[PDB]
């Protein structure tokens, strides 16, 4: 396990946040408003476990423990609930910022030392293992505290000490008809050119709601590969891919929203009283006899080998069939806790099986109560991207092998050739329809619709966000890039009067 992420949000309450070079573009206040709403939704979808806070300065009315004037905190470090979303959407919109100005202050002097103090205290209040210290300001001018040299000096001293304590502040470029220049009051008070007249600080992705979910460095299972009977290797087995789905129905009372205790009970038909575990026998009536058995030996038949791996041998990869595929491939990483020195061994065996292209066929048992299956181990090497960041981890891609009874029969099919002109026709078709693959561009539109529906009903929207069905081809460009190829291939193969159906 590793610590959490602390995301600190802090916007100015002044006229600069409420104004634009073109008021059609949403003012810095409201722009920060959709940013925080979007990141809240993204965190809810992805990492709805860390803590998020909202605080203001510049507002002439303040509310904080330190009683720093013009420093008003709104929400403590909190997981974003629908309450926070709705209480921030009221001020969302150019009309909402007027409501803000009315019921909330806007425009007054303040010191960066004050906000640094209050945010340091708020971070001091948390009681969780922590890894990320992220503070995201919201302002469209660097000078206002460089104007007061003493204020600038004490603010930068406080910020430097905080970043020594790991408190990591990120600058947000914000639109300003006068500019939001850097290297004037910035690049010397932020830990990490253009006057940043625009507001480009990856705000596009901050508005890009993410429909993703993954756990925080969670170990799946660590096993110990016995070589023959005594020499054992500690291995970490993990996945870079794992099926995701909508959260299961969280049962709750229709009159209290309280999860009703769902307790099941088998009971005697003779009496109605509860059936003890002794009262129940396992039965499978084969033929005319009812074979009576129990659970312990049932799982002792389900289980056959210890949690671990039993090596079978080495074999060139050519000895596997492409249609042979039992269950989706996993990754294996060296583990140096139960068996130390297996990293040198892992590197040696990795290189050696790379040389001879010999896969490691192995009898594999993940845990108890599970049969030992047979798995193919292929060296999955480290692949470095442009920035030399490993996009493919070094280790073994573990591939799983079915059994004889685990393969259904295929009725004999005719292999009737096609003329080379037809082959070239579809070659042209596919070359027109050619593109690259990337799994981050593919999703389940049903799942995306589920997510958007759940949000918009929790967001109380009049209409759900519409999932994009990327699992359907674009018929316009389709027929554009086919043209006469389709019916040409038809007349080459199919009779014009005979459709493939009927």
């Amino acid at each position: 396990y590793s610590g959490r992420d602390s995301l600190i949000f802090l916007v100015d309450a002044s006229k600069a946040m409420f104004e634009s070079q073109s008021e059609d573009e949403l003012t810095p206040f409201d722009m920060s408003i959709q940013c925080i709403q979007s990141v809240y939704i993204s965190k809810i979808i992805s990492s709805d476990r860390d803590l998020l806070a909202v605080v203001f300065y510049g507002t002439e009315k303040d509310k904080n423990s330190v009683n720093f004037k013009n420093i008003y905190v709104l929400q403590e470090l909190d997981n974003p609930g629908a309450k926070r979303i709705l209480e921030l959407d009221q001020f969302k919109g150019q009309q909402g910022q007027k409501r803000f100005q009315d019921m909330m202050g806007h425009g007054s002097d303040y010191s960066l030392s004050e906000v640094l103090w209050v945010c340091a205290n708020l971070f001091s209040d948390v009681q969780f293992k922590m890894s990320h210290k992220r503070i995201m300001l919201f302002t469209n001018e660097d000078n206002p505290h460089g104007n007061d040299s003493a204020k600038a000096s004490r603010a930068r001293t406080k910020a430097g000490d905080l970043r020594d304590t790991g408190i990591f502040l990120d600058l947000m470029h914000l639109k300003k008809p006068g500019g939001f220049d850097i290297s004037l009051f910035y690049r010397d008070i932020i830990s990490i050119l253009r006057v940043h007249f625009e507001e480009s600080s990856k705000l596009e992705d901050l508005l890009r709601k993410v429909r993703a979910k993954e756990t925080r460095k969670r170990a799946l299972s660590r096993l110990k590969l016995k070589l023959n009977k005594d020499i054992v290797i500690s291995v970490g087995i993990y996945n870079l891919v794992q099926k995701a789905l909508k959260p299961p129905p969280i049962k709750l009372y229709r009159e209290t929203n309280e999860p009703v205790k769902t307790k099941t009970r088998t009971f005697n038909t003779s009496t109605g009283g509860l059936l003890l575990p002794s009262d129940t026998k396992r039965s499978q009536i084969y033929g005319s006899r009812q074979i009576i058995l129990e659970k312990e030996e049932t799982e002792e038949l389900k289980r056959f080998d210890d949690p671990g791996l039993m090596l079978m041998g080495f074999k060139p990869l050519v000895l596997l069939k492409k249609h042979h595929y039992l269950r989706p491939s996993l990754f294996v990483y060296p583990e140096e806790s139960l068996v130390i020195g297996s990293s040198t061994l892992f590197s040696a065996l990795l290189i050696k099986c790379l040389e001879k292209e010999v896969a490691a066929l192995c009898r594999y048992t993940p845990r108890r109560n599970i049969p030992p299956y047979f798995v193919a181990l292929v060296p999955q090497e480290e692949e470095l991207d442009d920035q030399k960041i490993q996009v493919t981890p070094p280790g073994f891609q573990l591939v799983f092998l079915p059994f004889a009874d685990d393969k259904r029969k295929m009725p004999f099919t005719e292999k009737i050739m096609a003329t080379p002109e037809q082959v070239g026709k579809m070659k042209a078709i596919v070359e027109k329809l050619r593109f690259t693959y990337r799994s981050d561009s593919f999703e389940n539109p049903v799942l995306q619709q589920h997510f958007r529906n759940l949000e918009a009903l929790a967001l109380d929207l009049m209409e759900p966000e519409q999932a994009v069905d990327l699992t359907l081809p674009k018929v316009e460009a389709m027929n554009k890039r086919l043209g006469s190829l389709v019916d040409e291939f038809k007349e080459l193969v199919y009779p014009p009067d005979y459709n493939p159906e009927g």
Binding site: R265, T266, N268, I292, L293, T298, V486
Partner: protein, 61 residues
């Protein structure tokens, strides 16, 4: 059992198919029927699910 269907090519081509599952992990044909231990009968084994509020002495729902 095959999959009698039609693969479709965009909006101007479609051909019928008879799909087959070559690799298909075999399952258990019969589950362990929970019979009685006194009469060896599922019929003596009757079960129910009781939705009752987890508080207030398990208020029935």
């Amino acid at each position: 059992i095959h999959w009698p269907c039609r693969l479709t090519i965009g909006s101007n081509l479609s051909i019928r198919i008879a799909a087959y599952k070559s690799i298909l992990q075999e399952r258990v044909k019969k589950t362990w029927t929970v019979v009685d231990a006194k009469t060896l009968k599922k019929e003596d084994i009757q079960k129910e699910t009781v939705y009752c509020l987890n508080d207030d002495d398990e208020t029935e729902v």
